[PDB]
Amino acid sequence: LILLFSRTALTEKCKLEEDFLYMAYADIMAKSCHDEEDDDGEEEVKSFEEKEMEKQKLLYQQARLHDRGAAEMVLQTISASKGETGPMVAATLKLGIAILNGGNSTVQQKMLDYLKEKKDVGFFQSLAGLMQSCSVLDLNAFERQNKAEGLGMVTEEGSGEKVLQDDEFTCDLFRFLQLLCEGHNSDFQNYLRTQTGNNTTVNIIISTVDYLLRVQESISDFYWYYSGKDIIDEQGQRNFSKAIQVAKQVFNTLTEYIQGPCTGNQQSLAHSRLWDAVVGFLHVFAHMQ
Amino acid sequence: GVEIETISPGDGRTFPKKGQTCVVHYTGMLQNGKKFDSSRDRNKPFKFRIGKQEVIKGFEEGAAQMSLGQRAKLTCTPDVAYGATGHPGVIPPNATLIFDVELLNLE
Amino acid sequence: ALSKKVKLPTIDLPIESVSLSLQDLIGYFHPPDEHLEHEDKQNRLRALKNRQNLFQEEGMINLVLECIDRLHVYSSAAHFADVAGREAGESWKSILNSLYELLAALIRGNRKNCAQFSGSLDWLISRLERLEASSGILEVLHCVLVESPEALNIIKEGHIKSIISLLDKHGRNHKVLDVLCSLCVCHGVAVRSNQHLICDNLLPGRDLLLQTRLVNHVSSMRPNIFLGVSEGSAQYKKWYYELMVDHTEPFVTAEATHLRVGWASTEGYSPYPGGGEEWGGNGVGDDLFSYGFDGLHLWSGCIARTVSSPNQHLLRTDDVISCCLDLSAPSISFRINGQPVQGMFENFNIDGLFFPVVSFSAGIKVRFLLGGRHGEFKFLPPPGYAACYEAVLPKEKLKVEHSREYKQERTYTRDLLGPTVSLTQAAFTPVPVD
Amino acid sequence: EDPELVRAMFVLLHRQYDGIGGLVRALPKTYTINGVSVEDTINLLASLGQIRSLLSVRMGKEEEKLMIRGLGDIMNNKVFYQHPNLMRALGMHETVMEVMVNVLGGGESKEITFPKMVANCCRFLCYFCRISRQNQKAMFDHLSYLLENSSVGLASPAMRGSTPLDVAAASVMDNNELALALREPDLEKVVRYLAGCGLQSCQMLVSKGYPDIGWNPVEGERYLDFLRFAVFCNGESVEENANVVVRLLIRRPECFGPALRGEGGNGLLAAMEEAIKIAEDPSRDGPSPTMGNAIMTFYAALIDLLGRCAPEMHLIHAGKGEAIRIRSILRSLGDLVGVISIAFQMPTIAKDGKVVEPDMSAGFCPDHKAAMVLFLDRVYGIEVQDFLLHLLEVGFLPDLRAAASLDTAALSATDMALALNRYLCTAVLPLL
Amino acid sequence: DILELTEQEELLQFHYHTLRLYSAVCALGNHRVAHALCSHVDEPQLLYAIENKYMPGLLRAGYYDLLIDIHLSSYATARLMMNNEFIVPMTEETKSITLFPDENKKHGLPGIGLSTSLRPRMRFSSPSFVSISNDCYQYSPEFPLDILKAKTIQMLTEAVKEGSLHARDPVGGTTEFLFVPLIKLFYTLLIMGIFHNEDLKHILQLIEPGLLQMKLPEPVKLQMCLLLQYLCDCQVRHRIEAIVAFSDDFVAKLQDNQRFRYNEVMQALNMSAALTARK
DSSP states (O other): OHHHHHHHHHSOOSSOOOOHHHHHHHHHHHHHHOOOOOSOOSSOOOTTTTHHHHHHHHHHHHHHHHTTSHHHHHHHHHHHSSSOOOHHHHHHHHHHHHHTTTOOSHHHHHHHHHHHHHTOOHHHHHHHHHHHTOOOOOHHHHHHHHSOSSSSSTTOOOSOOOSOSSSHHHHHHHHHHHHHTTTTOHHHHHHTTTOSSSSSOOOHHHHHHHHHHHHHHHHHHHHHHHTTOOSOOHHHHHHHHHHHHHHHHHHHHHHHHSSSOOHHHHHHHHTTTHHHHHHHHHHHHHHHO | OEEEEEOSOOOSSOOOOSSSEEEEOOBOBOGGGOOOOBSSTTOOOEEEESSSOOSOHHHHHHTTTSOTTOBEEEEEOTTTSSOSSOSTTTSOTTOOEEEOOBEEEEO | OOSSOOOTTTSOOOHHHHHHHHHHHHHHTOOOOTTSOHHHHHHHHHHHHHHHHHHHHHHTTTSSHHHHHHHOOOOSSSHHHHHSSSOSOTTHHHHHHHHHHHHHHHHHTTSOOOOTTTSOSHHHHHHHTTOSOOHHHHHHHHHHHHHOOOSSSSOOHHHHHHHHHHHHHSOOOSHHHHHHHHTSOSTTOOOTTTHHHHHHHTTTTOSSOOOOOOOOOOEEEOBSOOOOOOSSSOOOOOOOOEEEESOOOOOSSSSOOOOBOSOOOTTTOOOOSSOSSSOOOOSTTOSTTOOOOSSSOOOSSSOOOOOOOSSOOOSOSSOOEEOOOOSSSOOBOOEETTEEOSOOBOSOSOSSOOOOOEEEOSSOOEEEEOSTTTOOOSSOOOTTOOOTTSOOOTTSOOOBOOOSOSOOOOSSOOOOOOSOSSSOSSOOOOOOOO | OOHHHHHHHHHHHHHHHOHHHHHHHHGGGOBOOBGGGHHHHHHHHHHHHHHHHHHHSOOOSHHHHHHHHHHHHHHSOSSTTTOHHHHHHTTHHHHHHHHHHHHHTTSSOOSOOOOOHHHHHHHHHHSOOSSOTHHHHHHHHHHHHHHHTOOSOBTTTTBOSOSTHHHHHHHTSSOHHHHHTOOHHHHHHHHHHHHTTOOOOOSSSOSSSOOOOOSOOOTTTHHHHHHHHHHBOSSOBOHHHHHHHHHHHHHSOOSOOSSOOSSOOOOHHHHHHHHHHHHSSSOSSSSOOOOOHHHHHHHHHHHHHHHHHSOOTTTTOSSSSSHHHHHHHHHHOOTTTTOHHHHHOOOOOOOOOSSOOOOOSSOOOHHHHHHHHHHHHHHTOSOSHHHHHHHSSSOHHHHHHHHHOOOSOTTTSSSSHHHHHHHHHTOOSSOO | OOSGGGTOHHHHHHHHHHHHHHHHHSOSOOSSHHHHHHHHSOHHHHHHHHHOSSSOHHHHHHHHHHHHHHTSSHHHHHHHHHTTOOBOOBOTTSSOOOSSSSTTOOOOOSSSSOOOOOOOOOOOOOOTTOOSOOOSOSOSSOOOHHHHHHHHHHHHHHHHHHHHHTOSSOSSSSTTTTTHHHHHHHHHHHTTTOSOHHHHHHHHHHHOOOTTSSOOOHHHHHHHHHHHHHHHHHHHHHHHHHHHHHHHHHHHHHHHHHHHSOOOOSSSOSOGGGTSOOO
């Protein structure tokens, strides 16, 4: 099955098909590896009798999935879409974060070896396209949606929002980036900026900084729009929570990029447009508080 | 128009009239032994009614001589056929047709 | 540079170098040889498609195809070969086929570029005006049909008739049909702008229409009585035998019901179930050399030779059949129910030998009445005639045989019968000596 | 081997494991017809099956006739307009869209110029909007591509200029939510499409050359009509769309001025007189025995769009809602102030008389005057005594004509009196 | 002859490509080409070609594909396209449908059941080559299905009996050339609802113990997957019919209960739209 998916993704199409079977099986695998609840749940359980067993079972499930070549399948499926946002890319990223949970190192080594031995160029370009295709708060869309059928949702057209086109997809993509670079992986940290073996170099760091600047500008514009009001709407609460979660995920991804001592990544951060983003965030915080 | 070569004995008293269906189990045949359609391999009766000219006039001109239970060999002039080109796809142009019409029942 | 019939030693004409270049180019466009692994095959296919698209864009926005068409000045088999150098078009067919194959491969590409060979009429009619090779046209039509079907509207009734006429003057090659399959639905990818027009136009031409037959199986029956007629030492010339039929229902399976009581020529007609361009024939009165007698119709080789006689009817129940034989003066007349019929047969196969035979189909019952106690003659023999009994050999009993076929329907035993037409091998004649 | 085999195998395995998924997917397709209407549903199902069978293959000469016959058979359907939910869930609109893509093909070829299915299907699908607006919501997604390929020439009214804009107009007929859901890029697209109609005209009707039909050109009015439908509502003017529409229209000059000088143009005081002197006595062409209505109709459509684009005053915001800036901008486009003289003239001439003389072909229409008075009411209004003291009437010549044209005659009346009556009905200037 | 083509390689290819052309010209529905093709090949010829044993494998598959593309092409395609609509009418006979035939919650036989859906009309044609305006049709000739079903069942039983023995010499050509066209014909006859209840019972009992136990090649597995998909689709259709049959009674009870409660403030009291209607 994994060979079938890999050979379907390897053959060029210049178009992302539907492939409902791929979606169903990626969802099945992601739910199979999602044994944990990632919440409080029960009371304070002891942290060695069950925690070690849970880690061992997660490692066993990840080994079962990736011993057949799941990592190569995920990389090929990501590189297949030439920077086009699609549900199949979302399913692939969900599978990636499902098999990369816990900061596994064997899958990271396998992906790095595959990328080095194949000299792939479409992966980084696809990642840059996905970053450029991400969404923002879209203040004008929220303003238009606020005034509907006189006031509110009197028309009852549907339960949709049309205020953040891709927020779960963006969070999944950045969680995949963080997990893929987790564990102070120095070679993988340096591989996202240089690509020495590759003929064409794409800087993921600058794209991440640009996306952070974009979301900071969007949040500041939302605050400036809402500065005249006094009470918080429920839609305002949901949009604020989504924006805060996306910004927190981007910040975590940036921390994992330079968590270990990496001179090149630190200099790239310093020479980027980070400082304007931090200035805007501080300006937002000083009045949010 | 048509030549009637009887190949079976007939009573000669019962004749097909106008306004009633006639059961005919024939077998078409082109020239030099070729054929194109048979109406007995399907094992179904072929019933047609006289008056609306839904069938070619060759059958009408050929069924006015033989009686019930009499098998005859028919020949169709291209002038009395469909036309200069005939039926497109099964009849060649300017070609005569051979039939083996037979009357069994009259209703 | 040598198109204008210039002097040969002035500017060189390196046929060997251009042949080597063409061979290297054709081997350079090799199909990816899919028997190897998927990764390398996919890489080769991607490189080939990108190369072909780029070559297209670089080449025939305004060039390449014009150069190839100007190169195609070979309109004579050997005149231009002799006029310019020793030979010019020694291998024109192979290079033309390979050039069209590479052209179609370039047209395929990434399924996004089909303009020159699919949106024009002059180049298509220039291709169709020669009609020597069909590999390139099939490839380009198949690729257009796969990508986006829009090159079939160019194909008109004239092109279809020209392609069909290729099967008439030139023998079948199974490639024309594989092309006409590509001018059809091809399981979904169809356009009814003109493809259905030409599909309906395939039928009235009747140069593609084929005829199929379905005939019942029949066998020939002969007794052991051999005439053994010779020249100079003849013994008997008169014979008379009759047969009876009781169950003779027609329409058992179809109109193809065979029931013949006459004779067929020994030389020319053989017990073979098929063969021949003119439908062959495996019964009496089936071939051109026989006549047959069903009582009404005497066709031979699909030729209308019916006779006229009063009270014409099939060989129904209680209908006698009589036969007459003569050797000095050819005069054969057939009498049914006491009334002789017309159709006198003259100058039969006097030279040689012939045997009494009869053909029959399924669901028939016939009786043999040769004479004596075995055969009771219903009607009296004509004057000057003798019954078919005097030609009985001693120390044997007359019976019927299998008419020199191979094997009948046997369940357990599986015997093989060797070459034995009759009692002798060289000639079937008596031995009068002095 | 044979990866299609393993693909089908695992598809079947997953589908048989996840029966709940098949159950939830199949249920929206299901419908339920009651009793008697089975017979009329069978014919509809057969017609749709024939359409779907012809969908995969393309259309030619007789196939267009077959499709039109099938559509004529499907129009006289009882349960067509009685079960809109079945019509939406049965996926006909996707079939018609795919047929449209097949007909258009690559584009800029127009092998067959006979769009009649699309207009009838769109109008009959969008006529009902009180129930199951989800069909219009679905067509809103296709609206972007539909506006992308807005070709010229519609066979149903024998007009040219915009083939599929009727579908868009029916899509934004009376839906305020759909109008609010409109975005900026498609408005930019239609603005650039309108900006391309600035080329001058030499003959009575010519696109590039070799004219065929020279009755009446309307190629410049369809875009304005679509913008008017997208900027207004049943009884309200959407300000969010109006602001971006007027900003895009004012950002670049696209209205060519055949009588003014310099950049800009849009001079009514000369162009209207040129139109009424070139269209009343002569034909649409210059040299003609004793442009046409196209230029004046285009100007009236632009005026209607601008008037409906102006924000409503003293109804929601009166001087405290940023509308002052846009009102001043609209006022700056004086020639626009001095349109009362334009509204005063009555260039119709009823002619007629004693010896029959029926039918008019080059008559001024009162709808254009209604457009001028609507623009005046929307922008300036009659809230001040100055306008009443300057005009004292909606019009002297039209009112005198209406007073004179009052007789029980089948030839003098029922030809122009209806238009004047409608124009007087639409005149609310003396009101308020 | 007819069997001499097993030696002549070129003539066998010629005839196979002629059959492929005949299949390709008349496909995806056609008006007059089907009749002209039926002029050349008739019912008894096709029946003997599909029932013969010594016939070459290529010609057998060609004749099978020709028969399917002439007769069972348009109707089967139309039914396949409509099979994803699930339009269930409400009459007096559509209420007697349950999820299980008994109270034991038995799964039951997927093939046998009561559908009461909106099936298309099976209207054939009887042209006899002397007629006019013969365009709306399904079958150019009148195939006798009563003997066709029996022939198909008999040949399927013979084929599975031969394959159970695992003979070295197959029927035609090899083990797949005799088996792929037979399953193709059986599948394209089963999807059209031609088979009756007893034929469905025989088919189900044929594979219940087995057809899936021996070794099969790839195309036979493809055909088996298609048959299983059709069976599961029939099960889904039965489930949907049972669901809507229960839903009619449930919504009737809900309407009765809502009518029992008195809550009306509109001027048009006791109106039908007060139960279930937006306005």
